[PDB]
Write a protein that binds this DNA or RNA. Structure first.
Ligand SMILES: [Mg+2]
Ligand SMILES: [Mg+2]
Ligand SMILES: [Mg+2]
Ligand SMILES: [Mg+2]
Ligand SMILES: [Mg+2]
Ligand SMILES: [Mg+2]
Ligand SMILES: [Mg+2]
Ligand SMILES: [Mg+2]
Ligand SMILES: [Mg+2]
Ligand SMILES: [Mg+2]
Ligand SMILES: [Mg+2]
Ligand SMILES: [Mg+2]
Lengths: 394, 107, 63, 131
RNA sequence: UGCUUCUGGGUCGGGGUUUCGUACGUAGCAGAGCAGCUGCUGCGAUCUAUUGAAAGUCAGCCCUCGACACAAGGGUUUGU
RNA sequence: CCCAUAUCCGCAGCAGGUCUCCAAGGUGAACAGCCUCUGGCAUGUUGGAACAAUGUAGGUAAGGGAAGUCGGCAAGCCGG
């Protein structure tokens, strides 16, 4: 017969083939549509999930019950050292899709990016591009290059640029960089292309891509959780206590005469390590890396107009399981996908943000730099020493 | 150069963290025997019965957190086997593991 | 932003951390974590507990 | 103007909260919450500031054996505020009310959460404390 | 993911952090008292000082550039 | 000689069944439970590595307290 009482479906069919993601680095499945009006710019970047923390900002939204009242609000730090452009790549629009038409790489390439090619950097002779490099220093090659540029100008429609990360500037373990095609959006192809040509072998900080209070998307792989049963995977009901063949199951997996079992039934399998895009995350703050000047370094990133201290975002004891954020970083509102030390892809929004919640300007009053390695109760080591006083170890 | 001895210390508390109760002192011996296999590239390891008794000193569930040990590489005795050098592992009673470095003890 | 002070220990509570207990007769107390909150609900005396602030103050320790 | 934010509701249908006003009622058996659509096998659940339908289990007999409106003024479950605080009270308590909001009683014994004072004026008037 | 840019990770140590709550010893004319010897000396739970002490802390925490050794290697295949 | 988680009967070195004798210290009312000495054994027809689901046997859960279910089944409270 029919289902007695109505209940909505358990879990979405729009993320259906819940398998281990086929890629570790998040992939921009779609870039924002370009208008030849806007000046030449980039559309995506690449950062690493450091950790989360509080934020005390003044809320401005006329009509809401928290108008001009300080609210505590979680954020997430994504460390983002500048990316190094190491090549461009053009596409043609064909009636069968968008075929890649030609790639061109810069003369010099870091060993960081060259690690991305070899599955074993220890047994290798490190020969990648060793013969390609000899095209940038002779007329026989320089000519061909200029040809391969005037061709992409004549034919290519979309221009992407290849830009790897800088993996030595991070507190991680892996030295092998992450590559990615960031699509240049802007003017005509000729001006889009003689732009990246100037930026070959150059660095692109995040200020050149993202601003403040800018809603962006985050693309990355969910944190993996292994072979989980159906109660954890699909969050189905738990059978009552008197069930014989175990209770964390689905009792009925199909009617009789649809004599298969269907693709919309909740069944056990891999949970986590999926590829998700999460949209409308606001950039609260594009902080700045450490830097020496006059011998003394300036580390105060977490100091605001109201706090006026000398503390960096680095909590007491460093971010847990990640390390020390000593580079540029973005502060996204709320959680993001992935685990710590995971490479997230930050993409410009695909929509036209016209909303008071999207166009709100942000002014942080206080950033929370206590420790996350337990219930830490002190903002700075100085404040801790000046509170506890002198100990025995002195 | 080939017959050398030197004292180490082994943070069993971290080489054992996670294993179940009834298999702690055992995993601590398998981890001593593997530690000496790393610090001295010899597959033959020989754990002295004083170091054994000192690992099972408290019990099976409460293995000491650290342990001071004296790895001594020696020439294989009679019955020349595929191995040429074996590693004798020896206990070293210690009152505190504070500022205890790896010492290159000598004869 | 106003920083409170744990009613049991005496440490400084920052905007994000801790809780508030409101007894049936007013008398709101702020707590830093569930160690303070539990030593309060257990009706312990902050002056007989070495790590609190009322203890260091009573026994005049420090300075 | 300002709208009630959501709080960690912690009073399933069946909760016996004590009656914190002088109507002679001692208890309030919550029988359903106002404004809840529902879901398969999910008890309704009231929080601070939520009007509910209740029932006096012990108290003056002219109030027993009938359904009453009520407003939860104090809940024991820790609810968060937008200003980054987690508040909770020593007991669960609510007051009796008519469908338009006026208190059936006169006074309120104990505090009244600001999530209930921002929302019900005729309870904030008879309030003793706030938050 | 790492596996010789005199570097690289690994172990140990140190520092940061953090959890619990003030270690053993010793001192005390603090201690309900009790006993012996003519004030002294013993027994005595607890207390105070040394003592936010002691203990643990990456095995899936963070920094060392402190000692120690190590790492240029092995095996199987692949052709337009 | 065995007299029973291997010498008997259950097809077997089978968690079943099968008649008696003697009977230490502590705690405690106690031949109760728990640790120990005399005496005995090597985990009950195997080991190693992992620590997924679903199980089996134990646990603990904020707020509510039978709203669950045919039914307070199970668990829990109580306990000297
Ligand atoms: Mg229907
Ligand atoms: Mg059954
Ligand atoms: Mg933490
Ligand atoms: Mg139902
Ligand atoms: Mg067994
Ligand atoms: Mg047997
Ligand atoms: Mg066996
Ligand atoms: Mg419960
Ligand atoms: Mg509870
Ligand atoms: Mg019923
Ligand atoms: Mg029912
Ligand atoms: Mg029963």
């Amino acid at each position: 017969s029919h289902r007695k009482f109505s209940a909505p479906r358990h879990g979405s069919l729009g993320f259906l083939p819940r398998k281990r993601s086929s890629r570790h680095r998040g992939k921009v499945k779609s870039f924002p549509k370009d208008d030849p009006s806007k000046p030449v710019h980039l559309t995506a970047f690449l950062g690493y999930k450091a950790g989360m923390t509080h934020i005390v900002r003044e809320v401005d939204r006329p009509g809401s019950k928290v108008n001009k009242k300080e609210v505590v609000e979680a954020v997430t730090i994504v460390e983002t050292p500048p990316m190094v452009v190491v090549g461009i790549v053009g596409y043609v629009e064909t009636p069968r899709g968008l075929r890649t038409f030609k790639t061109v790489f810069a003369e010099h390439i870091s060993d960081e990016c060259k690690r991305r090619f070899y599955k074993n950097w220890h047994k290798s002779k490190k020969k990648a591009f060793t013969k390609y490099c000899k095209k940038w220093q002779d007329d026989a090659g320089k000519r061909q290059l200029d040809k391969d540029f005037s061709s992409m100008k004549k034919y290519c429609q979309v221009i992407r640029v290849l830009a790897h990360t800088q993996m030595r500037l991070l507190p991680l373990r892996q030295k092998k960089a992450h590559l990615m095609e960031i699509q240049v959006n802007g003017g005509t192809v000729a001006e889009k292309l003689d732009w990246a040509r100037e930026r070959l072998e150059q660095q692109v900080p995040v200020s050149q891509v993202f601003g403040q209070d800018e809603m962006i998307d985050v693309i990355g792989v969910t944190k993996g959780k292994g072979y989980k049963g159906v109660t954890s995977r699909w969050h189905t009901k738990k059978l009552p206590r008197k069930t014989h063949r175990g209770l964390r199951k689905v009792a009925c997996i199909g009617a009789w005469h649809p004599a298969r079992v269907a693709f919309s039934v909740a069944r056990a399998g891999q949970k986590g390590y999926h590829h998700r895009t999460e949209i409308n995350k606001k950039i609260y703050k594009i902080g700045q890396g450490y830097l020496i000047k006059d011998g003394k370094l300036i580390k105060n990133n977490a100091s605001t107009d109201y706090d006026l201290s000398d503390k960096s975002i680095n909590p007491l004891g460093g971010f847990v399981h990640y390390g020390e954020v000593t580079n540029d970083f973005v502060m996204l509102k709320g959680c993001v996908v992935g685990t710590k030390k995971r490479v997230l892809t930050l993409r410009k929004s695909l929509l036209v943000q016209t909303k008071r919640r999207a166009l709100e300007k942000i002014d942080l009053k206080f950033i929370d730099t206590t420790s996350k390695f337990g219930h830490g109760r002190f903002q700075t080591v100085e404040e801790k020493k000046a509170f506890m006083g002198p100990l025995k170890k002195d | 150069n080939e017959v050398v001895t030197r004292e180490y210390t082994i943070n069993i508390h971290k080489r054992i963290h996670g294993v179940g109760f009834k298999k702690r002192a055992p995993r601590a011996l398998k981890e001593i025997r593997k530690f000496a296999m790393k610090e001295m590239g010899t597959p033959d390891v020989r754990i002295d019965t004083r170091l054994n008794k000192a690992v099972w000193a408290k019990g099976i569930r409460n293995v000491p957190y650290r342990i001071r040990v004296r790895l001594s590489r020696k020439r294989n005795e009679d019955e020349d086997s595929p191995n040429k050098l074996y590693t004798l592992v020896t206990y070293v009673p210690v009152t505190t593991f504070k500022n205890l470095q790896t010492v290159n003890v000598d004869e | 932003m106003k920083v409170e002070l744990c009613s049991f220990s005496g440490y400084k509570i920052y905007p994000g951390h801790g809780r508030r207990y409101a007894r049936t007769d007013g008398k709101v107390f702020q707590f830093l974590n569930a160690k303070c909150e539990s030593a309060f609900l257990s009706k312990r005396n902050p002056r007989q507990i070495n790590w609190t602030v009322l203890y260091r103050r009573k026994h005049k320790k420090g300075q | 103007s300002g709208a009630k934010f959501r709080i960690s509701l912690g009073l399933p249908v069946g909760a016996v909260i004590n009656c914190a006003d002088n109507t002679g009622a001692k208890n309030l058996y919550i029988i359903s919450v106002k404004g809840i659509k529902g879901r398969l096998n999910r008890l309704p659940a009231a929080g601070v500031g939520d009007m509910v339908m209740a029932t006096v289990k012990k108290g003056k007999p002219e109030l027993r054996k009938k359904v009453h409106p009520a407003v939860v003024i104090r809940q024991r479950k820790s609810y968060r505020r937008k200003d980054g605080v987690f508040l909770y009270f020593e007991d669960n308590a609510g007051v009796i009310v008519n469908n338009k909001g006026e208190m059936k009683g006169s006074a309120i014994t104990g505090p009244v959460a600001k999530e209930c004072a921002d929302l019900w004026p005729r309870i904030a008037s008879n309030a003793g404390s706030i938050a």
